[PDB]
Every structure is written in structure tokens, then in C-alpha cells.
């Protein structure tokens, strides 16, 4: 019994001391000591019963004995209490570290997707930028869905620790701000990449549309030389007039696109847009002269 106090004091020394792997083992050891403390409890209960020795009513040290057994009871009960106090503190470290891994995993994920949306690949041709835009829009849809699942999960997990009353939950909250900041940075990056694609697609469409209209305008001009009068007059009014009305609407619609685009650009890029638009208009007007003489128009329009 006298040694048992020293034996308990040795445990008292081990229990008082200051990555996920360290904490998980830390608690693994500490669980064994608590089970060992229960073994001391078996020793203390009988030792207390033996120390009592009331029936014998011996008095050599009875006053001293009643104090040693009581000190032993205080020694063990306090020791058991201390074992529980550390167990919670160690569990906090494991839970804290376990959650940190996830926050870093999510933070790594955003760095990955950020790289994807960081990519300022404008596109080789109109056929390309269409794939880019119609793919990236799916990538944004997916990221935006699953990303929010995980950030909500980690916030739920982190909210549980802080709401639980963590002794370290000042850096848990710091981590929460850090993650949610970086998350809302990705979504915002995603959007400005989506916009940047739409703008490229709008210009690419104008450039591609310019080639087609210019080709069509001049191509239909070549057909004019081949081109009795009753048959030609009906042929022009019925089909040819409608054909140009359609072609002119395309030129005007292209012209609208030129202007819309013209707001958003400036300098050399703006100059090239004006060059192609002027290119289309010159060919268009050139066709209008040659075509004017042999053209039938209705009185109404």
C-alpha cells in the first residue's frame, strides 16, 4: 500500500505532459493507462477494505492508518480524474488534426481547379472556342455543385468542433475564414473565365461570320454574269429579290455584331474588326451597283 502511492505518483508523472499520427497513437497509449488505472481500482477497493481493520479494533497506528488509506483513496480518485482530463485534451488534438487534414485537402482541391480556370487559353479558331466554352460551362457546373458539398461538409465539421467547445478553436475559426475565402475566390475566378470565353466566342463568331458573308456576297456576285424578258423578270422578282433581302439582313446583322464588339475592344484589335467589316461592306456595295440595273422590286417594299 505504501508503494502503491509511489506507483500512482509515477502514473501521475506520465499523464501530465505536453500530426494526426502522433495524436492517434497518443490516445492509443492513454486508453491503455486508463484500463491500467482500473486495475489499480481493483487494488484500491480491497486495500481499502484491508486497511479498515475495524473489527480487530487494533490501535497501534489506527489514527495513522485511517489517514494513509484515506490519502490513498484521494490519491487514486484524483488520479482517475486526471486520466479523464487528459483523455479529453488528447482527443481534442486528434480531432483538431483530423479536421485540419480535410481543410488542407479542400484547399489543395481549389488550387487544382483554380489552375484549370487560371488557364487563359483563348482558342485557335471558332470551332475550338465553342468546345472550350461548352466544356468549361460543364466543368463550372460540376465544381460549383460538388465543391459546395465539401465546403459545406468541412464547415459543418468545423462548426461541430467550435460548437463542441475546443480548447484550440481560435485557429479552427481562422482556418474556416481561410477556406471559405479561397472557395469564394474560385467561384469568382470561374465566372470571370466564363465571361472571358463568351467574349472570345463573340469575336470568333464575328470573324468566322465575316469570312462566310464575304464569300457569299462575292460568290453570288459571280453568279450574276450568267443571269425571255418575261421569264427573267419573274425569275428575279420571285427568287433573286428575296435572296438579297436575306443576304442584306445578314450583312446588317453582322454590322450590328461589329458595333457590339466594337465597344469592348480598342486599338489594333478594334482596327482589324473595322477592316473586315469594311471589307464586307465594300463587297456588298460592289454587288449592289452591278445588280441594280436588272432588278425587280415590288411597289410596297
Amino acid at each position: 500500500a505504501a508503494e502503491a502511492e509511489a506507483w500512482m505518483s509515477e502514473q501521475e508523472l506520465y499523464m501530465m505532459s505536453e500530426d494526426e499520427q502522433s495524436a492517434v497513437s497518443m490516445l492509443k497509449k492513454h486508453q491503455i493507462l486508463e484500463q491500467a488505472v482500473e486495475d489499480y481500482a481493483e487494488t484500491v477497493h480491497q486495500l481499502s477494505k484491508t486497511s479498515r481493520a475495524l473489527v480487530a479494533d487494533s490501535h497501534p497506528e489506527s489514527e495513522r492508518i485511517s489517514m494513509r488509506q484515506s490519502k490513498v483513496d484521494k490519491l487514486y480518485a484524483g488520479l482517475k480524474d486526471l486520466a479523464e482530463e487528459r483523455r479529453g485534451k488528447l482527443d481534442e488534438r486528434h480531432r483538431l488534426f483530423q479536421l485540419n487534414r480535410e481543410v488542407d485537402d479542400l484547399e489543395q482541391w481549389i488550387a487544382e481547379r483554380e489552375v484549370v480556370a487560371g488557364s487563359h487559353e483563348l482558342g485557335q479558331d471558332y470551332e475550338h472556342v465553342t468546345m472550350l466554352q461548352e466544356r468549361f460551362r460543364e466543368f463550372a457546373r460540376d465544381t460549383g455543385n460538388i465543391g459546395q458539398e465539401r465546403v459545406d461538409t468541412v464547415n459543418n465539421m468545423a462548426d461541430e468542433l467550435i460548437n463542441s467547445g475546443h480548447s484550440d478553436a481560435a485557429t479552427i475559426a481562422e482556418w474556416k475564414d481561410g477556406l471559405n475565402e479561397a472557395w469564394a475566390d474560385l467561384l469568382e475566378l470561374i465566372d470571370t473565365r466564363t465571361q472571358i470565353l463568351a467574349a472570345s466566342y463573340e469575336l470568333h463568331k464575328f470573324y468566322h461570320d465575316a469570312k462566310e458573308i464575304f464569300g457569299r456576297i462575292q460568290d453570288k456576285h459571280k453568279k450574276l454574269p450568267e443571269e425571255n424578258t418575261v421569264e427573267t423578270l419573274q425569275r428575279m422578282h420571285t427568287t433573286f429579290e428575296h435572296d438579297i433581302q436575306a443576304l442584306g439582313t445578314q450583312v446588317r446583322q453582322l454590322q450590328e455584331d461589329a458595333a457590339r464588339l466594337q465597344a469592348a475592344y480598342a486599338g489594333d484589335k478594334a482596327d482589324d474588326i473595322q477592316k473586315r467589316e469594311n471589307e464586307v461592306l465594300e463587297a456588298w456595295k460592289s454587288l449592289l451597283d452591278a445588280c441594280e440595273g436588272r432588278r425587280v422590286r415590288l411597289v410596297d417594299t
Binding site: 467550435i162 475559426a173 465571361q195 467574349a199 469592348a264 475592344y265
Partner: protein, 426 residues
């Protein structure tokens, strides 16, 4: 028929030629103005303040210098604009009324740092009739508002806002902060500057000896062709007069030695004129005990290099008390709003020193159980103070002072009156 844009951005935004006045919704006061017809393509501009990681080789600040704001990452690494554009970034560096200045550093790639110079400033033409316009009221309005304006024709990778003791420079020099400081170098070719540092009596007393303004020439450890005459004011008396000198280069911490023997100390009306062939920090220390001076000077020099920061004090509460000293930190702190605190006390911006502890005192209200309690102010960090806390009014007033004393009264730095909520017993 179309008009420039105007919106709030966290870190990034798209801008075309039409225009863009963009306020940083994250960091209040952070504004970027792109005039119309200024950028040619549609472009993604990013204005970020670095906190996730430490950049390699951050800007080379000499001793006593310190970053006003954090470091800003620009969006397009080498973006070019035909016209000039405005990037306005809030800082928290106290200038002590023309005593200090702000140097603007830029890194083009991320390796090397140099200073950003702008050719000229014409507000009307650069704005180019921008609808938002509203360039802040005056340079004085900028100074009161703690907003650093950078005018630029192109973005570098990184911009840096640095706070330093003001330097008078040219391409016969003298200080614009302390009059009686002069360096006489024969005229006729490169640029060199001279900075004069003020010294306060109260701060000197806290840590037997008297001291002059620290005279410094920015390009230190440089040997001129011929010796240069130096004129320095004479500190009041307490041979007792001594001249201190430091030749440590660049970022390296200063080293002080006594050069009284190597220096003919001519006198010209409350001044000391002398010669020196080498560019270095110079200081006059007047005290009779000669051996003590350098060590005592070191005790002062360590104090002097500390940089000032316009910080706000904030006091949260819950039925218990949290005291924050913050500079750009998120107001309505997330941990508190989570733990059901409330913002019972705000403060006006008051100058405090980084790395220097500020002591907390409560007058007329409950005290902590505790051994007085204290925290230091680290710039751009969240400085958190927890608190374990008659029956008429719960009002109380608490003060924040640099000095610990009850022997004599020391003037306070901040004084926040506070009132509790009494939701439930604690």
C-alpha cells in the same frame, strides 16, 4: 450609347475597353479605375493581398522600414495599357505627420524588386471623362483616409507599399524634417538621398544620456571621390559629447561604434561639422560616462526601428470579454459572431507600435481573476485578448497604455468606454 462599368470585386474581375471603376468589396478602400479606351482587349484583372503563403524574397526593406499594406498580386503579369490606370490600396502605416514617407516597390517577375516611378500626374486627362470619376478629394484627403494611390501604365507581378523615414534626395543637401542637418558634397553624377530621424524625450527617458537626430544617407557604405562635410545638431548636455557611426549595409541590422577620435568635430552655431569619406549612419550621444554610450544607444536603437501602425481597438463581450487590436482584420470577427459575442466598443484609429506590448487597464468595472495581463501588437495579425469576467449601472471605462505603474500617471493611447448586456448570469 454604352458606358463604363462600376462594381465590387473580391479579387478578380473582367474589364473591356468601355471602362471600369471597381471597389474591393473584401478590403474596403481597395479601388481600381480603368479609364475608357485604356485597355485594348477584354482582360481579367486580379488585385490580391497575400496571406496564404510567404513569397520568396519579399521586398528588400532596410532596418526600420516596414510594409504599409500587405503585398498585392496583380492579375495580368505584364499587362500594358495605352492610357494610365489607377490602383488604390488601403494601408495602415502611420506617417507621424510628414516625418515618414511611402516608397512604392514593384517586382516584375517575383525575383528582383525595384521602385515604381510614374512620369507625371494630370487627374482630368487620365480619368478621360470617366463617369464614376470621384478621385478622392485631395492628397490630404488621401492622407486622412490612409489610401495609397498608384498611377501606372503597366502592371508588374507584385506591388509593395513600404513605410520609411522620409528621405530628402536629388540628382549641398539638407533635411526637410529637421532643418539644421546638412551634407556638403562638391557638385558635379548620380542620385543620393539623406534622411534625418527625430528622437523623443519621453521615449528616451523610458530607457543618463542625450541623443541627436539619427542622420542617415540612403546609399550606405559608399566611398565618395572626396570627403563630404556633415553638419548635425548638438544634443543638449547631461569630453561628454560623442559621435556614433554604423556602416552595416542594406537589410543587415546596424552595428554601432564610437568614432570620436577619427572625427574633427568643428562647431558652427549649435552644430557639429566634420568630414567623412564613407556613407553611413551617424549619431551624436552626449553623456559623461563614455563607455556606456554604445550599449545604451543600442537599447534606444532597437526601440527606434519599431514601425508605427494606425490600429483600431475593438471590444467584444458575452455573458466573457474579448479585446482585439486590429489593422485590416475582418471586423465582426467570425469566431465571435459564431460564439454569440457582440460589438460593445469600437475605437478611433490610434498609433501603436508593432512588437511592443500594450497593457490593458479597467477603471470602474469588474476585473479579471488572474498578475496583470497584456498582449503585443503584431501588424496584419489578429491580436486576441481573452478575459475572465455595485449594482446600479454596468458602465465601465478601460484604457490601453504602452507603459505598465501607479507612481506617476502616463498618458494613454486608447480609452474605450464600454457597457455590458446582462443577458444571463456568468
Amino acid at each position: 450609347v454604352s458606358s463604363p462599368v462600376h462594381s465590387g470585386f473580391l479579387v478578380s474581375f473582367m474589364v473591356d475597353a468601355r471602362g471600369g471603376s471597381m471597389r474591393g468589396s473584401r478590403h474596403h478602400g481597395m479601388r481600381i479605375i480603368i479609364p475608357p479606351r485604356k485597355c485594348t482587349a477584354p482582360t481579367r484583372i486580379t488585385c490580391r493581398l497575400v496571406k496564404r503563403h510567404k513569397l520568396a524574397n519579399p521586398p528588400p526593406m532596410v532596418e526600420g522600414e516596414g510594409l504599409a499594406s500587405r503585398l498585392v498580386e496583380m492579375g495580368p503579369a505584364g499587362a500594358q495599357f495605352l492610357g494610365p490606370v489607377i490602383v488604390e490600396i488601403p494601408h495602415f502605416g502611420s506617417m507621424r505627420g510628414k516625418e515618414r514617407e511611402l516608397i512604392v516597390l514593384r517586382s516584375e517577375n517575383g525575383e528582383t524588386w525595384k521602385e515604381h516611378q510614374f512620369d507625371s500626374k494630370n487627374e482630368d486627362l487620365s480619368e478621360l471623362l470617366n463617369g464614376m470619376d470621384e478621385e478622392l478629394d485631395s492628397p490630404e484627403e488621401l492622407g486622412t483616409k490612409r489610401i495609397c494611390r498608384i498611377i501606372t501604365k503597366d502592371f508588374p507581378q507584385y506591388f509593395a507599399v513600404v513605410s520609411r523615414i522620409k528621405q530628402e534626395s536629388n540628382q549641398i543637401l539638407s533635411s526637410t524634417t529637421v532643418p539644421l542637418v546638412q551634407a556638403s558634397f562638391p557638385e558635379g553624377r548620380i542620385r543620393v538621398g539623406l534622411q534625418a530621424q527625430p528622437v523623443p524625450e519621453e521615449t528616451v527617458k523610458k530607457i543618463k544620456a542625450t541623443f541627436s537626430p539619427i542622420v542617415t544617407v540612403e546609399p550606405r557604405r559608399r566611398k565618395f571621390h572626396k570627403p563630404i562635410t556633415m553638419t548635425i545638431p548638438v544634443p543638449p548636455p547631461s569630453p561628454s559629447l560623442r559621435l556614433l557611426c554604423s556602416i552595416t549595409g542594406g537589410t543587415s541590422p546596424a552595428q554601432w561604434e564610437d568614432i570620436t577620435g577619427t572625427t574633427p568635430l568643428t562647431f558652427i552655431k549649435d552644430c557639429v561639422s566634420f568630414t567623412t569619406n564613407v556613407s553611413a549612419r551617424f549619431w551624436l550621444a552626449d553623456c559623461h560616462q563614455v563607455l556606456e554610450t554604445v550599449g545604451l544607444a543600442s537599447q534606444l536603437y532597437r526601440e527606434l526601428i519599431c514601425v508605427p501602425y494606425m490600429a483600431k481597438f475593438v471590444v467584444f463581450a458575452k455573458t466573457s470579454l474579448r479585446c482585439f487590436c486590429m489593422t485590416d482584420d475582418r471586423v465582426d470577427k467570425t469566431l465571435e459572431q459564431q460564439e454569440n459575442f457582440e460589438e460593445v466598443a469600437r475605437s478611433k484609429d490610434i498609433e501603436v507600435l508593432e512588437g511592443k506590448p500594450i497593457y490593458v487597464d479597467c477603471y470602474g468595472n469588474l476585473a479579471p481573476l488572474t498578475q496583470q495581463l497584456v498582449f503585443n501588437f503584431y501588424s496584419f495579425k489578429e491580436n486576441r485578448l481573452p478575459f475572465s469576467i455595485t449594482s446600479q449601472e454596468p458602465c465601465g471605462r478601460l484604457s490601453f497604455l504602452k507603459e505598465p505603474t501607479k507612481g506617476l500617471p502616463q498618458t494613454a493611447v486608447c480609452n474605450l468606454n464600454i457597457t455590458l448586456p446582462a443577458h444571463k448570469k456568468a
